[PDB]
Amino acid sequence: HERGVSIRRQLLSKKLSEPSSLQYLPYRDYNYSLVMGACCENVIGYMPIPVGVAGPLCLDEKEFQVPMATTEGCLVASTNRGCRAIGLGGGASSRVLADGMTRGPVVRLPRACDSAEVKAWLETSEGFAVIKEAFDSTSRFARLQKLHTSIAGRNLYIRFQSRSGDAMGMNMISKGTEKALSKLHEYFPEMQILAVSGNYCTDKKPAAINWIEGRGKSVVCEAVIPAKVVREVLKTTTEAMIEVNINKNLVGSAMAGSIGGYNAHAANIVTAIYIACGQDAAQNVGSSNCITLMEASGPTNEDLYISCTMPSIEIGTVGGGTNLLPQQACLQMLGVQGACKDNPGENARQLARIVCGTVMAGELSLMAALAA
Amino acid sequence: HERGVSIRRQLLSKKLSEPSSLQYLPYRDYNYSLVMGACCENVIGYMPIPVGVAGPLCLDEKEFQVPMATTEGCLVASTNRGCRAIGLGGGASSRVLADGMTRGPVVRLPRACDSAEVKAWLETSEGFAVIKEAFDSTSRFARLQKLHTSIAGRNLYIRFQSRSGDAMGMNMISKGTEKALSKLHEYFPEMQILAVSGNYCTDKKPAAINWIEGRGKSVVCEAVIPAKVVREVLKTTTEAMIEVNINKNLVGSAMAGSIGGYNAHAANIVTAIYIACGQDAAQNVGSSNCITLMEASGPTNEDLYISCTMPSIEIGTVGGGTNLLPQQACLQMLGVQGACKDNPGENARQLARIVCGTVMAGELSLMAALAAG
Amino acid sequence: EPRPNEECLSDAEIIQLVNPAYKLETLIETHERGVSIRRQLLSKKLSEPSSLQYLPYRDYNYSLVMGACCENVIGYMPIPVGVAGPLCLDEKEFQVPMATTEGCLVASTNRGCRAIGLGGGASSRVLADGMTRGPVVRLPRACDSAEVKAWLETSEGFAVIKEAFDSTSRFARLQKLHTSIAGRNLYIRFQSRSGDAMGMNMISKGTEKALSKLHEYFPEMQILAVSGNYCTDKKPAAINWIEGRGKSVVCEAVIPAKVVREVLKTTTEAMIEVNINKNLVGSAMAGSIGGYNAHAANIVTAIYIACGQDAAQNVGSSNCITLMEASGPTNEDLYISCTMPSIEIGTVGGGTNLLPQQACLQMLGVQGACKDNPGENARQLARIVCGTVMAGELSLMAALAAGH
Amino acid sequence: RPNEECLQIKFLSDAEIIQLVNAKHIPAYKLETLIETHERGVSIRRQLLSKKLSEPSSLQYLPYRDYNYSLVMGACCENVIGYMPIPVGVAGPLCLDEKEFQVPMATTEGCLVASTNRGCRAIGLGGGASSRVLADGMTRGPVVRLPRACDSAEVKAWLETSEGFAVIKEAFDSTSRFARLQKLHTSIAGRNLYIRFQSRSGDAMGMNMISKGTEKALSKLHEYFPEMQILAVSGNYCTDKKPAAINWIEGRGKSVVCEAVIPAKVVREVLKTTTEAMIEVNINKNLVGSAMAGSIGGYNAHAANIVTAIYIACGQDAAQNVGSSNCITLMEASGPTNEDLYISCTMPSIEIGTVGGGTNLLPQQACLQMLGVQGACKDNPGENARQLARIVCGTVMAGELSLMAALAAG
Ligand SMILES: CC[C@@H](C)C(=O)O[C@H]1CCC=C2C=C[C@H](C)[C@H](CC[C@@H](O)C[C@@H](O)CC(=O)O)[C@H]21
Ligand SMILES: CC[C@H](C)C(=O)O[C@H]1CCC=C2C=C[C@H](C)[C@H](CC[C@@H](O)C[C@@H](O)CC(=O)O)[C@H]21
Ligand SMILES: CC[C@H](C)C(=O)O[C@H]1CCC=C2C=C[C@H](C)[C@H](CC[C@@H](O)C[C@@H](O)CC(=O)O)[C@H]21
Ligand SMILES: CC[C@H](C)C(=O)O[C@H]1CCC=C2C=C[C@H](C)[C@H](CC[C@@H](O)C[C@@H](O)CC(=O)O)[C@H]21
Ligand SMILES: Nc1ncnc2c1ncn2[C@@H]1O[C@H](COP(=O)(O)OP(=O)(O)O)[C@@H](O)[C@H]1O
Ligand SMILES: Nc1ncnc2c1ncn2[C@@H]1O[C@H](COP(=O)(O)OP(=O)(O)O)[C@@H](O)[C@H]1O
Question: C232, C281, C335: best mutation site toward chain B, by most B Cβ within 10 Å?
Answer without folding.
Answer: C281
